């Protein structure tokens, strides 16, 4: 049985960065050759595994996370980068064996009005711990006032939309990201090639 690589790389919607949709591929022959078929991956950028060898290796599970970040930020979803996206929204660990893959999903996620359903977290008190997932609506203040959750001086809604719109340049265009990781534990490996 082959691993279900088709509902991960094709879906009609992808998780927005604040909710980053992790998933688990387990107990299946996985040939990472099913892909390399449709993604002119801007940045396949695999780290440490390289393409041919993983056809060969076997591991306990493969974790595939999916997000939608605009083009200028695709650099940040990598190891060792700092910025709004990798510090308040998704943090890759310092050490990694995985392949970020991004394709310009201009056609599906672009609304001429804007697609206000894709959003990112502008402000958080501390940088996210590696692979942390954080989902909340809580007001961020600058003053000491609790502010009672209203839109006012020193009171703001932390998520903000990407405002994706077609007449926008390459920098501001949806770029779906799939961060495949390789988890190996002392338990017997079940995801071979």
């Amino acid at each position, epitope marked *: 049985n082959l691993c279900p690589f088709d509902e991960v790389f094709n879906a009609t919607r992808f998780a927005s960065v604040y909710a980053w949709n992790r998933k688990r591929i387990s107990n299946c022959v996985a040939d990472y050759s099913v892909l390399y078929n449709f993604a002119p991956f801007f940045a396949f950028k695999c780290y440490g595994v390289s393409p041919t060898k993983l056809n060969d290796l076997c591991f306990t599970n493969v974790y595939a996370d999916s997000f939608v970040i605009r083009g200028n930020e695709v650099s940040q979803i990598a190891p060792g980068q700092t910025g709004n996206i990798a510090d308040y929204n998704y943090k890759l660990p310092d050490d990694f064996t995985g392949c970020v893959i991004a394709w310009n999903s201009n056609k599906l996620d672009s609304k001429v009005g804007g697609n206000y359903n894709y959003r990112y977290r502008l*402000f958080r*008190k501390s*940088n996210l711990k590696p692979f942390e997932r954080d989902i909340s609506t809580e007001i961020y*203040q600058a003053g000491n006032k609790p502010c009672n959750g209203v839109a006012g001086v020193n009171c*703001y809604f932390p998520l903000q939309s990407y405002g994706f719109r077609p007449t*926008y*340049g390459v920098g501001h265009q949806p770029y779906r990201v799939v961060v495949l990781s390789f988890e190996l534990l002392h338990a017997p490996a079940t995801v071979c090639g």
Partner: antibody
Amino acid sequence: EVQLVESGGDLVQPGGSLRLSCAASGFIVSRNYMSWVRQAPGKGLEWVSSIYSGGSTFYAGSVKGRFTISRDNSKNTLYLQMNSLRAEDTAIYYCARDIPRHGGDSWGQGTLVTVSS
Amino acid sequence: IRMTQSPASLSASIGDRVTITCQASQDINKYLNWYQQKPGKAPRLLIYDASNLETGVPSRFSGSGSGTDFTFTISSLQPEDIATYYCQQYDNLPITFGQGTRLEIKR
């Protein structure tokens, strides 16, 4: 009132180390985006350094490794430790809080640095 | 970004309609702020995002733009409007300001 007395610095020999201090009225320094612009006399303002709400530091090309930024929770006082100075750093330095997208600002009156021999 | 402001000596009489044009080298979308620096006194923020004038400003200054070329407008030139205006882009890490357009009054 967001009024800033970012007043530190007056001048040193070339190769010295000065220490700026900023200050803060309605907000806390460690919770809001802040940065330090640099206005040379008679020239367009240039951007030196910037801090984030979680400690991320970004610098300018001309100040890579000579300048440092540092944020002080105890007394506001966004600190900028100028090190490895030179004879072309003479400029007026303004403390600045930038809320990123929703729009408000503080640019404090700013302090003069004339570092010479 | 190679920010470019085209008018540097522009002089209009009392109560006139003038316009400032800041131009960029890439798509900065709408993230370009307009500043106003009076002589000696610290700069003020006039139009954040290129399309939103901050509250409390008088209501004459309007700006609109997208992608590379941006424009700044002055609706009523009151005598107490002499300053130097700057355009800043705040989302590309090498934040580069513009040259300034020193405005003066004629009589």
